[PDB]
Design a protein around this motif. Structure first.
Motif, PDB file in Angstrom:
ATOM      1  N   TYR A  14     -51.530 -34.689 -48.365  1.00  0.00           N
ATOM      2  CA  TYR A  14     -52.711 -35.528 -48.333  1.00  0.00           C
ATOM      3  C   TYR A  14     -52.586 -36.595 -47.251  1.00  0.00           C
ATOM      4  O   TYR A  14     -53.432 -37.487 -47.138  1.00  0.00           O
ATOM      5  CB  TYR A  14     -52.924 -36.157 -49.703  1.00  0.00           C
ATOM      6  CG  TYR A  14     -53.676 -35.241 -50.630  1.00  0.00           C
ATOM      7  CD1 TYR A  14     -53.070 -34.718 -51.773  1.00  0.00           C
ATOM      8  CD2 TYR A  14     -54.999 -34.885 -50.357  1.00  0.00           C
ATOM      9  CE1 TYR A  14     -53.766 -33.862 -52.624  1.00  0.00           C
ATOM     10  CE2 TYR A  14     -55.706 -34.033 -51.199  1.00  0.00           C
ATOM     11  CZ  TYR A  14     -55.085 -33.527 -52.331  1.00  0.00           C
ATOM     12  OH  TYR A  14     -55.791 -32.696 -53.169  1.00  0.00           O
ATOM     13  N   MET A  23     -62.585 -31.170 -47.341  1.00  0.00           N
ATOM     14  CA  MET A  23     -63.334 -31.749 -48.463  1.00  0.00           C
ATOM     15  C   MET A  23     -64.656 -32.352 -48.007  1.00  0.00           C
ATOM     16  O   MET A  23     -65.690 -32.159 -48.647  1.00  0.00           O
ATOM     17  CB  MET A  23     -62.519 -32.843 -49.152  1.00  0.00           C
ATOM     18  CG  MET A  23     -61.312 -32.337 -49.892  1.00  0.00           C
ATOM     19  SD  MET A  23     -60.222 -33.685 -50.387  1.00  0.00           S
ATOM     20  CE  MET A  23     -60.029 -33.290 -52.087  1.00  0.00           C
ATOM     21  N   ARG A  29     -69.908 -30.457 -52.809  1.00  0.00           N
ATOM     22  CA  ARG A  29     -69.043 -31.496 -53.365  1.00  0.00           C
ATOM     23  C   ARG A  29     -69.390 -32.917 -52.914  1.00  0.00           C
ATOM     24  O   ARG A  29     -69.636 -33.789 -53.747  1.00  0.00           O
ATOM     25  CB  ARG A  29     -67.589 -31.206 -53.004  1.00  0.00           C
ATOM     26  CG  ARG A  29     -66.632 -32.324 -53.379  1.00  0.00           C
ATOM     27  CD  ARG A  29     -65.330 -32.232 -52.586  1.00  0.00           C
ATOM     28  NE  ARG A  29     -65.349 -33.112 -51.420  1.00  0.00           N
ATOM     29  CZ  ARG A  29     -64.796 -34.324 -51.391  1.00  0.00           C
ATOM     30  NH1 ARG A  29     -64.177 -34.797 -52.463  1.00  0.00           N
ATOM     31  NH2 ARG A  29     -64.864 -35.074 -50.295  1.00  0.00           N
ATOM     32  N   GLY A  53     -57.576 -42.591 -55.877  1.00  0.00           N
ATOM     33  CA  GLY A  53     -57.308 -41.569 -54.870  1.00  0.00           C
ATOM     34  C   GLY A  53     -58.423 -41.540 -53.830  1.00  0.00           C
ATOM     35  O   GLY A  53     -59.104 -40.525 -53.646  1.00  0.00           O
ATOM     36  N   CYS A  54     -58.583 -42.658 -53.127  1.00  0.00           N
ATOM     37  CA  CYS A  54     -59.638 -42.825 -52.129  1.00  0.00           C
ATOM     38  C   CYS A  54     -59.640 -41.952 -50.878  1.00  0.00           C
ATOM     39  O   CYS A  54     -60.678 -41.807 -50.234  1.00  0.00           O
ATOM     40  CB  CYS A  54     -59.710 -44.299 -51.705  1.00  0.00           C
ATOM     41  SG  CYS A  54     -58.307 -44.900 -50.718  1.00  0.00           S
ATOM     42  N   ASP A  75     -54.602 -45.203 -52.904  1.00  0.00           N
ATOM     43  CA  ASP A  75     -54.094 -43.886 -52.553  1.00  0.00           C
ATOM     44  C   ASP A  75     -52.607 -44.019 -52.269  1.00  0.00           C
ATOM     45  O   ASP A  75     -52.156 -45.035 -51.729  1.00  0.00           O
ATOM     46  CB  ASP A  75     -54.818 -43.308 -51.338  1.00  0.00           C
ATOM     47  CG  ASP A  75     -54.810 -41.786 -51.327  1.00  0.00           C
ATOM     48  OD1 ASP A  75     -53.714 -41.194 -51.326  1.00  0.00           O
ATOM     49  OD2 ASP A  75     -55.897 -41.176 -51.326  1.00  0.00           O
ATOM     50  N   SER A  77     -50.822 -41.538 -50.537  1.00  0.00           N
ATOM     51  CA  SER A  77     -50.450 -40.916 -49.269  1.00  0.00           C
ATOM     52  C   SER A  77     -50.692 -41.838 -48.084  1.00  0.00           C
ATOM     53  O   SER A  77     -51.316 -42.885 -48.218  1.00  0.00           O
ATOM     54  CB  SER A  77     -51.204 -39.599 -49.058  1.00  0.00           C
ATOM     55  OG  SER A  77     -52.513 -39.679 -49.575  1.00  0.00           O
ATOM     56  N   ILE A 103     -51.508 -45.054 -58.480  1.00  0.00           N
ATOM     57  CA  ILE A 103     -52.364 -45.832 -59.370  1.00  0.00           C
ATOM     58  C   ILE A 103     -51.687 -46.302 -60.658  1.00  0.00           C
ATOM     59  O   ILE A 103     -52.083 -47.314 -61.230  1.00  0.00           O
ATOM     60  CB  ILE A 103     -53.656 -45.061 -59.751  1.00  0.00           C
ATOM     61  CG1 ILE A 103     -54.635 -46.003 -60.463  1.00  0.00           C
ATOM     62  CG2 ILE A 103     -53.322 -43.881 -60.655  1.00  0.00           C
ATOM     63  CD1 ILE A 103     -55.020 -47.227 -59.664  1.00  0.00           C
ATOM     64  N   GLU A 104     -50.660 -45.589 -61.108  1.00  0.00           N
ATOM     65  CA  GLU A 104     -49.980 -45.972 -62.345  1.00  0.00           C
ATOM     66  C   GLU A 104     -48.840 -46.969 -62.166  1.00  0.00           C
ATOM     67  O   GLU A 104     -48.162 -47.307 -63.137  1.00  0.00           O
ATOM     68  CB  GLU A 104     -49.450 -44.730 -63.073  1.00  0.00           C
ATOM     69  CG  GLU A 104     -48.992 -43.623 -62.153  1.00  0.00           C
ATOM     70  CD  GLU A 104     -49.942 -42.448 -62.142  1.00  0.00           C
ATOM     71  OE1 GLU A 104     -50.218 -41.895 -63.223  1.00  0.00           O
ATOM     72  OE2 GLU A 104     -50.412 -42.074 -61.052  1.00  0.00           O
ATOM     73  N   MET A 130     -54.111 -34.204 -61.535  1.00  0.00           N
ATOM     74  CA  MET A 130     -54.553 -35.555 -61.171  1.00  0.00           C
ATOM     75  C   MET A 130     -55.392 -36.233 -62.256  1.00  0.00           C
ATOM     76  O   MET A 130     -55.449 -37.460 -62.320  1.00  0.00           O
ATOM     77  CB  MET A 130     -55.340 -35.527 -59.851  1.00  0.00           C
ATOM     78  CG  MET A 130     -55.491 -36.897 -59.175  1.00  0.00           C
ATOM     79  SD  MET A 130     -56.480 -36.903 -57.623  1.00  0.00           S
ATOM     80  CE  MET A 130     -57.091 -38.601 -57.591  1.00  0.00           C
TER      81      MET A 130
HETATM   82  N1  LIG Z   1     -51.438 -40.871 -58.757  1.00  0.00           N
HETATM   83  C1  LIG Z   1     -52.170 -41.060 -57.662  1.00  0.00           C
HETATM   84  N2  LIG Z   1     -52.318 -42.321 -57.196  1.00  0.00           N
HETATM   85  C2  LIG Z   1     -53.033 -42.509 -56.080  1.00  0.00           C
HETATM   86  N3  LIG Z   1     -53.655 -41.613 -55.313  1.00  0.00           N
HETATM   87  C3  LIG Z   1     -53.495 -40.373 -55.807  1.00  0.00           C
HETATM   88  C4  LIG Z   1     -52.799 -40.020 -56.948  1.00  0.00           C
HETATM   89  N4  LIG Z   1     -52.856 -38.647 -57.154  1.00  0.00           N
HETATM   90  C5  LIG Z   1     -53.565 -38.205 -56.142  1.00  0.00           C
HETATM   91  N5  LIG Z   1     -53.973 -39.196 -55.278  1.00  0.00           N
HETATM   92  C6  LIG Z   1     -54.728 -39.072 -54.034  1.00  0.00           C
HETATM   93  O1  LIG Z   1     -56.057 -38.735 -54.353  1.00  0.00           O
HETATM   94  C7  LIG Z   1     -56.618 -37.908 -53.297  1.00  0.00           C
HETATM   95  C8  LIG Z   1     -57.232 -36.677 -53.912  1.00  0.00           C
HETATM   96  S1  LIG Z   1     -58.480 -36.108 -52.727  1.00  0.00           S
HETATM   97  C9  LIG Z   1     -59.917 -37.230 -52.845  1.00  0.00           C
HETATM   98  C10 LIG Z   1     -60.028 -37.991 -51.518  1.00  0.00           C
HETATM   99  C11 LIG Z   1     -61.351 -38.738 -51.311  1.00  0.00           C
HETATM  100  N6  LIG Z   1     -61.596 -39.620 -52.439  1.00  0.00           N
HETATM  101  C12 LIG Z   1     -62.495 -37.745 -51.145  1.00  0.00           C
HETATM  102  O2  LIG Z   1     -63.416 -37.686 -52.070  1.00  0.00           O
HETATM  103  O3  LIG Z   1     -62.765 -37.306 -49.949  1.00  0.00           O
HETATM  104  C13 LIG Z   1     -55.500 -37.688 -52.275  1.00  0.00           C
HETATM  105  O4  LIG Z   1     -55.636 -38.607 -51.187  1.00  0.00           O
HETATM  106  C14 LIG Z   1     -54.235 -37.982 -53.085  1.00  0.00           C
HETATM  107  O5  LIG Z   1     -53.150 -38.451 -52.290  1.00  0.00           O
END
Ligand SMILES: Nc1ncnc2c1ncn2[C@@H]1O[C@H](CSCC[C@H](N)C(=O)O)[C@@H](O)[C@H]1O
Length: 321
Positions: A14, A23, A29, A53-54, A75, A77, A103-104, A130
């Motif tokens: 990611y 995406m 979507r 997960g922005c 996020d 990544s 996030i946690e 997720m």
């Molecule tokens: N536990 C977690 N904490 C934070 N970000 C997370 C996560 N698990 C997954 N993600 C992030 O959430 C994303 C899923 S993809 C969604 C990306 C964006 N919101 C879109 O709609 O275009 C990825 O960037 C991934 O790294």
């Protein structure tokens, strides 16, 4: 299982733009989330929003434009840094603040939030696990009376008849340029396949096997077992079963939104999940086929899934990645 560890390979995939390009190019979507937000501004105007997960920050920008008082985008990544730049490029720094991390475990600049938005789904809906993280954030941060979106999802199965696709994957190894490679099939059948299914090849009505309400659902509900009955529509040979999911935006909406990732709908990057049957069986139209499906996450890799399926009195266990 999803609150601890790291998952290097996961957050690293990611980090690149390719996955996000895919995406963003997924119109069903992306426009579904855009329409939901823009068509129901009452949900965002003057509220505090959390984007779990922005990614590039797209969803948070949608909320800000709708009237959000403050948006918090997180996020884990490295794509978070490119989002920091994109928000500045659009002059939204005074509304959207960005945080790098899981996030946690990260520290939020606020106590509670009014709304939570997120695009967390994977193949067969639950691949990647997720939703677990989203539920975690819900418990710790959602204000009393707040809402999480999308709020409702469902998973379904459909009978399939495609003897050529079956042969292409299994019978193929029987004769490779005059040589027998039949020992290869032993490692092919157990793997679920993500691919687009020809709608003309469906031989039964679809059947729901799971319903999720992100407000009442819990983490333990994400590992289930379900009995189902498929009602045959055509007299043909059953070669496989296909799974897909639907997403719903409903609570407090004056303009509800819905989209499906099924074979009868416009293609999405999620396609559909296919469980090939070792032994295809003849089916007759109007027939009722009783079955059972159990979905569990791989204990050695919590982001992958294990599916046990019974149909025609024959059971098989598959793995998704
Ligand atoms: N536990 C977690 N904490 C934070 N970000 C997370 C996560 N698990 C997954 N993600 C992030 O959430 C994303 C899923 S993809 C969604 C990306 C964006 N919101 C879109 O709609 O275009 C990825 O960037 C991934 O790294």
């Amino acid at each position: 299982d999803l609150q601890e560890d790291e998952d290097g390979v996961y957050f690293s995939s990611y980090g690149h733009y390719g996955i996000h390009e895919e995406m963003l190019k997924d119109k069903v979507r992306t426009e579904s989330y855009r329409d939901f937000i823009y068509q129901n501004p009452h949900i965002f105007k003057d509220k505090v929003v959390l984007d779990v997960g922005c990614g590039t920050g797209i969803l948070s920008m949608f909320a800000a434009k709708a009237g959000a008082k403050k948006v918090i985008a997180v996020d884990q990544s490295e794509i978070l840094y490119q989002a920091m730049d994109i928000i500045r490029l659009n002059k939204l720094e005074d509304t959207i603040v960005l945080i790098k991390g899981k996030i946690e475990e990260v520290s939020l600049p606020v106590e509670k939030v009014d709304v939570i938005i997120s695009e967390w789904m994977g193949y067969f809906l639950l691949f990647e696990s997720m939703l677990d993280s989203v539920l975690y954030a819900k418990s710790k941060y959602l204000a009393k009376g707040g809402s999480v979106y999308p709020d409702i999802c469902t998973i379904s199965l459909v009978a399939v008849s495609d003897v050529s696709k079956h042969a292409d994957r299994i019978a193929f190894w029987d004769d490779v340029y005059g040589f027998n490679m039949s020992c290869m099939k032993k490692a092919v059948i157990p793997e679920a396949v993500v691919e687009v299914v020809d709608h003309k090849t469906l031989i039964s009505d679809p059947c729901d096997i799971k319903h999720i309400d992100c407000h009442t659902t819990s983490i333990s509900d994400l590992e289930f077992s379900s009995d189902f009955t498929l009602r045959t529509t055509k007299t043909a040979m059953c070669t496989a079963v296909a799974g897909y999911f639907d997403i719903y935006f409903e609570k407090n909406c004056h303009n509800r939104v819905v989209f499906s990732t099924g074979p009868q709908s416009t293609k999405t990057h999620w396609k559909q999940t296919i469980f090939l049957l070792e032994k295809p069986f003849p089916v007759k139209a109007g027939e009722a086929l009783k079955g059972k499906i159990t979905v569990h996450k791989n204990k050695k890799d919590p982001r992958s899934l294990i599916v046990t399926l019974t149909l025609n009195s024959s059971t098989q266990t598959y793995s998704l990645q």
